[PDB]
């Protein structure tokens, strides 16, 4: 039962899995100011320089960013990769709630942003 015991495919190296490693013919994206939020992170920039920074179809991350932005959580980020804010889901580096700092309490109980004292 449960295919992973029967149809065990971990010994198979698919052409799908090879073609995404060395990226197999990604056309460079036109119209230079684009974002493509939702693109696979490139391992060429992790090891080496991938060259075409800013006009590469994959994303480039740096280890500088600290807190998540309010804007990626809705899918609206004009800044793109060169934002100062982290774009990961991690629900521990959120901004503090504005409605605690000025206006006492918050109104909705399902407020995502960080509630501190």
């Amino acid at each position: 039962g449960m295919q992973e015991i029967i149809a065990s495919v971990d010994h198979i190296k698919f052409d799908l899995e090879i073609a995404v490693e060395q990226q197999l013919g990604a056309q460079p994206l036109p119209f230079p100011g684009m974002d493509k939020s939702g693109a696979a992170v490139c391992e060429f920039f992790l090891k080496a320089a991938c060259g075409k920074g800013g006009m590469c179809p994959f994303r480039h991350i740096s280890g500088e960013k600290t807190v998540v932005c309010k804007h990626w959580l809705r899918g609206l980020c004009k800044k793109g990769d060169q934002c100062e804010f982290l774009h990961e889901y991690d629900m521990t580096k959120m901004p503090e709630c504005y409605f605690y700092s000025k206006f006492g309490e918050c109104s909705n109980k399902e407020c995502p942003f960080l509630h501190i004292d």
């Binding site: 149809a7 495919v9 010994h11 939702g38 696979a40 992170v41």
Partner: protein, 1177 residues
């Protein structure tokens, strides 16, 4: 890319049914039809339906009716297929196939009136008096078929160009009386929606158009125009009363052209929705919205409602042959039907897709009827989710076989008929006692004073005898001759006298003691049949014996003129037989290539086929055959089956009656089996676990079973290798059972496992739940099944949203008011040891909550030696109408062994819920990716990491509308949307990032997705709300796609039925998998990936098999398997058409090989390797 579709289960679940003269004008026949398969049933009288013919079609039957033409001896059928194909077919005598009388292609671009998307189904109707026949093509066109060189050319009547402007047709019938064939039509000139009834109150109308066949004109008589807004089917009231009863959802009308409209209501939902003048039927609150009905006699009507309840409406008739009022009574409840037929007086067939379609019996009570249940046809219903699992009690002798040992569990049926189905393909015997007896190769069990007394083994030098009883133990004394081998040992008389034959002498025995002896050219086989013994040597000499009392066997050598050498023999008698002109028959195959049946007391020639060893389809009177066996199988040994062994190829024949010779001919039946002193291979057994039939010995064993159903059942037996010999065996510690030799010389006392039911095409145990089985999930640890179910309770509240809390509103209506159905879900826990549901283990959900998915999720852990833990995870959300925000809840469960409750060994297992938290929106699908639960909340697909106690999120993307299916392998998630697409994902794990790779840019209504696996090619198998299959691939170096964004379909195939389930298992083809699926019409199919070189030798075969063979109902097997047309990159072979290459005779097999350019032995090595590798389950 290159694959083949193969079908491992014929689809069950009937849809259409009638009662017509299929074979002959004398008796009648239940003719049921399903998705692309026709069945014809007789009726043995306790009563039981008996199968008599089964037919397969390259097209799904959309309607079915029967008319009896002028001068014909039978009753023709009018089969309606998809995109307006009518096909008049008849039964044929002579050959036992179907003769097709007419096709009528009606698919035209100028008939569809510009509408591309066809929604309406074609509907055949015929006259009560059989004057014409009508077909409503496309919902706006009538095709009139005139009847009396027996047909007349049709003519299309445009419906919307007539009077009254029909537009929407609901149902249409022909009426009774009426010298011209009057066609009644329900329609709606101004169509409305239930839910918008304040601006359109009620609009349904009736035109009874009167058809002139000769003049080809048609005037409207008897219009009505203000029937209620929701009218379902109309029913022609029969001849002495006339008229029509028009079912509505909430009311019931009787209509006639001279009588004023009489109509009553049923429940009080006709308050503000219908201004038609309606009465109130008393003591009744029911609804007629999916109701199937028929007329029993006249002025009575059995109405199978939804909910399976059966009412009997009597039309209360005055003296004027008019209707005063209606009378209802609540009779017995039954299956949720999809059809309804009165057979003979007192019998009702209830054809149902979902549920076992059964036969009823009704008698009057001392007007009022009571229904009794005679027989039911087994049905694997609409297979919703089906999970592969492992059996429990495979014996320790078979325990170290290298292949996996597994059997699928299917959520079949719906509702009250909801069930689980434990399907299996081969038979795994229970071995109770084994031995190791070398040297001896043949075996026999005879009955001595009805348990079996003696086990007789022939060695190459001597003979072993065994005594049975308390302990089976080897026998030492005289009687049998152990000084040499024994050719054959068997009973003579009736279990009182035993005969063995040695290659020199012939021995009676009245028990252990020898009665007398007759000596005799090596004797190679014997025919002990009834009271006669025919003994044949090696050079072709034939002698015959006979019991004569004084008991003493008498030599009577047959008077035969040997034109050539007799090769093999058989004997056979007719307990309930058809061999007309208990009577004994001798079958005799000579070496010239002929077959001769002999009447046995005399020796005159009765039946003669001049070219026998080819393998022809139908034989009629006037190489190197090994073995030939005639046996009867079924109730009272009714129908006989020929079984031969010709050049490593099994081919078995039926028998059917057909008018100084035998009045029979032999029709060939299909197979899935290859065979690649004298030893018998065809070993007839009577009463093993009640089942009678043949065991077939060889390199692949096959149990041949025919029960009283009359349906042929071939069951393989793949465990424990090829089998040399076999014998039935009935003992004390072994019940009715069997006894065979392994190839390694191991005798095995065995009994069939008693929990299955071998009457069905696969051996299946049908587990009734009496609630709708939605999902099923094998848990490997602690070895149980987790099933989400649902029962229907009456709804009583209505949720609202007032900005601060939810406010329920109580439904408060009259006491004459049917209630809406609320569904309460609960998660069962099923034990494979005994299939009882485990008590005190049932998770029950909230008041409005619905399981949308259940899978078995492998989350990573720090406990075991691997990472994974095999949890059961269910996503579930609350349906409280559209005005309330739908939110959901992820539920992670793990089965935990505890100490058992005393007296209940099944209660050692119980759920423990690790996680139950309400999410931020609906939860729609779930997955596991290297130990990460992947969930789809709304328009976002999250990816959770389970900590010691809680789920913490890692990544997501914004997806399309409603992701309802996800499966994944090795950080690649494939998603599936309701309307849009599939959207394959990818997950780097070093950074917590989920991303989109590619997507189908078209709109497409996916049922469920899969992963086709080849050596390096990973296909993306997807099913279409259009009964299709298609395989997308991610090809970045291709240029007809765009650079890594668009998926491309590479294989297209039109399966006839919807698909929800997908199983992958490796073939017994270096690294390829078989991605199985179970079609929603109840069948089970395959997809086997092939190489290109093997593919195009068979594509050249299929293009020749399509053209040069007379298919059933005149259909085209190519256009049926074209994509969606019932742009197209077809690359999947029709393995149900390539299987008609095996059915061809070997004279005709060699003509298609020479017309495509190969030898026939290569194609048989091409095809039969696709059946060897696919022998799972």
């Amino acid at each position: 890319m290159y694959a083949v579709y193969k079908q491992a289960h014929p689809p069950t679940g009937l849809e259409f049914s009638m009662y017509c003269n299929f074979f002959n004008n004398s008796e009648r026949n239940l003719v049921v039809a399903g998705t692309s398969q026709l069945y014809v049933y007789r009726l043995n009288r306790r009563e039981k339906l008996e199968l008599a013919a089964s037919f397969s079609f390259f097209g799904n039957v959309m309607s079915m009716a029967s008319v009896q033409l002028a001068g014909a001896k039978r009753d023709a059928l009018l089969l309606s297929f998809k995109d307006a194909k009518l096909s008049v077919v008849e039964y044929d005598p002579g050959t036992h196939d179907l003769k097709t009388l007419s096709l009528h292609y009606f698919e035209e671009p100028e008939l569809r009136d510009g509408f591309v998307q066809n929604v309406h189904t074609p509907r055949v109707r015929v006259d009560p008096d059989g004057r014409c026949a009508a077909m409503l093509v496309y919902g706006t066109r009538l095709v009139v078929l005139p009847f009396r060189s027996s047909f007349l050319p049709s003519y299309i009547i445009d419906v919307r160009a007539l009077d009254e402007k029909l537009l929407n047709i609901i149902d249409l019938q022909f009426l009774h009386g009426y010298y011209e064939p009057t066609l009644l039509i329900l329609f709606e000139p101004n169509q409305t929606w239930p839910g918008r009834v304040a601006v359109r109150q009620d609009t349904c109308s009736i035109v009874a158009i009167s058809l002139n066949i000769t003049q080809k004109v048609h005037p409207v008589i008897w219009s009505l125009t203000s029937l209620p807004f929701d009218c379902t089917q109309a029913l022609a009231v029969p001849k002495p009363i006339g008229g029509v009863v028009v079912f509505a959802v909430n009311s019931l009308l009787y209509l006639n052209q001279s009588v004023p409209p009489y109509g009553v209501a049923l429940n009080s939902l006709t308050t503000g929705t219908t201004a038609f003048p309606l009465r109130t039927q008393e003591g009744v609150r029911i609804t007629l919205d999916c109701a199937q009905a028929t007329f029993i006699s006249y002025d009575k009507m059995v109405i199978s409602l939804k909910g399976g309840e059966i009412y009997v409406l009597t039309l209360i008739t005055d003296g004027m042959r008019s209707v005063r009022a209606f009378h209802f009574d609540k009779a017995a409840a039954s299956v949720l039907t999809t059809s309804m037929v009165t057979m003979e007086p007192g019998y009702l067939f209830l054809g149902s897709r979902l549920g076992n379609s059964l036969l009823l019996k009704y008698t009057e009570k001392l007007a009022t009827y009571s229904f009794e249940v005679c027989d039911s046809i087994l049905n694997i219903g609409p297979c919703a989710n089906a999970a592969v699992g492992e059996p429990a009690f495979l014996s320790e002798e078979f325990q170290n076989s290298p292949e996996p040992d597994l059997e699928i569990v299917v959520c079949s049926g719906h509702g009250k008929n909801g069930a689980l189905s434990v399907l299996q393909k081969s038979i795994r015997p229970q071995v109770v006692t084994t031995f190791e007896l070398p040297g001896c190769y043949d075996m026999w069990t005879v009955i001595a004073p009805r348990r079996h007394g003696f086990l007789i083994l022939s060695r190459e030098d001597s003979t072993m005898i065994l005594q049975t009883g308390q302990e089976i133990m080897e026998l030492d004394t005289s009687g049998f001759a152990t000084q040499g081998p024994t050719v054959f040992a068997g009973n003579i008389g009736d279990n009182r006298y035993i005969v063995q034959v040695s290659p020199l002498g012939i021995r009676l025995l009245e028990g252990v003691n020898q009665l007398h002896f007759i000596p005799v050219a090596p004797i190679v086989q014997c025919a002990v049949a009834d009271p006669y013994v025919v003994i044949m040597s090696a050079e072709g000499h034939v002698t015959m014996f006979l019991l004569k009392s004084d008991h003493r066997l008498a030599l009577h050598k047959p008077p035969l003129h040997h034109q050539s050498k007799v090769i093999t023999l058989c004997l056979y008698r007719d307990l309930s037989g058809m061999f007309t002109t208990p009577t004994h028959w001798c079958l005799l195959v000579r070496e010239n290539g002929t077959m001769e049946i002999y009447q046995l007391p005399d020796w005159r020639l009765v039946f003669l086929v001049k070219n026998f060893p080819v393998g022809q389809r139908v034989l009629v009177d006037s190489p190197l055959v090994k073995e030939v066996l005639l046996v009867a199988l079924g109730s009272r040994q009714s129908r006989p089956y020929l079984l031969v062994h010709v050049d490593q190829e099994l081919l078995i024949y039926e028998a059917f009656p057909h008018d100084g010779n035998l009045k029979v001919r032999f029709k060939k039946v299909p197979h899935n089996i290859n065979f690649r002193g004298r030893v018998a291979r065809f070993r007839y057994f009577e009463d093993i676990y009640g089942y009678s039939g043949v065991f077939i010995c060889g390199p692949s064993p096959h149990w041949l079973l025919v029960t009283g159903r009359g349906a042929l059942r071939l069951h393989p037996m793949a465990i424990d290798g090829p089998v040399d010999s076999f014998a039935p065996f009935h003992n004390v510690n072994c019940p009715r059972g069997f006894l065979y030799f392994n190839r390694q010389g191991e005798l095995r006392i065995s009994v069939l496992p008693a929990y299955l039911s071998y009457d069905a095409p696969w051996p299946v145990r049908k587990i009734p739940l009496r609630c709708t089985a939605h999902y099923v999930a094998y848990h490997v640890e602690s070895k149980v099944y987790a099933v989400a179910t649902s029962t229907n309770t009456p709804c009583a509240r209505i949720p609202r949203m007032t900005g601060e809390e939810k406010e329920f509103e109580t439904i408060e209506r009259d006491e004459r008011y049917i209630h809406p159905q609320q569904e309460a879900f609960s998660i069962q826990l099923i034990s494979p040891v005994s299939w009882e549901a485990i008590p005190n283990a049932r998770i029950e959900l909230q008041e409005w909550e619905h399981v949308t998915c259940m899978k078995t999720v492998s989350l990573r852990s720090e406990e075991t030696v691997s990472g994974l833990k095999g949890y059961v995870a269910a996503g579930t959300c609350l349906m409280q109408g559209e005005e309330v925000t739908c939110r959901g809840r992820i539920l992670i469960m793990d089965v935990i062994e505890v100490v058992p409750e005393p007296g209940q060994p099944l209660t050692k297992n119980k759920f423990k819920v690790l996680y139950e938290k309400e999410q931020k929106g609906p939860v729609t699908a779930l997955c596991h990716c290297n130990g990460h639960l992947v969930s789809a909340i709304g328009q976002k697909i999250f990816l959770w990491s389970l900590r010691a106690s809680e789920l913490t999120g890692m990544a997501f993307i914004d997806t399309q509308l409603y992701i309802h299916q996800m499966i994944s392998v090795k950080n690649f998630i494939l998603a599936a949307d309701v309307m849009k697409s599939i959207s394959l994902l990818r997950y780097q794990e070093e950074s917590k990032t989920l991303s989109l790779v590619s997507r189908d840019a078209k709109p497409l209504e996916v049922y469920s997705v899969d992963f086709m696996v080849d050596n390096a090619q990973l296909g993306f198998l997807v099913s279409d709300r259009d009964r299709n299959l298609m395989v997308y691939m991610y090809l970045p170096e291709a240029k007809e796609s765009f650079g890594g964004m668009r998926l491309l379909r590479r294989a297209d195939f039109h399966v006839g039925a919807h698909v929800n389930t997908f199983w992958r298992t490796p073939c017994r083809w270096e690294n390829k998998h078989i991605t199985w699926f179970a079609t929603l019409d109840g069948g089970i199919g395959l997809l086997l990936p092939m190489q290109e070189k093997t593919y195009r030798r068979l594509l050249m075969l299929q293009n020749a098999l399509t053209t040069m063979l007379p298919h059933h109902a005149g259909l085209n097997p190519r256009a049926f398997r074209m994509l969606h047309v019932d742009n197209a990159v077809r690359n999947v072979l029709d393995g149900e058409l390539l299987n008609r290459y095996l059915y061809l005779s070997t004279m005709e097999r060699s003509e298609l090989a020479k017309k495509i350019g190969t030898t026939p032995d290569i194609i048989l090595d091409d095809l039969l390797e696709t059946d060897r590798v696919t022998a799972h389950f």
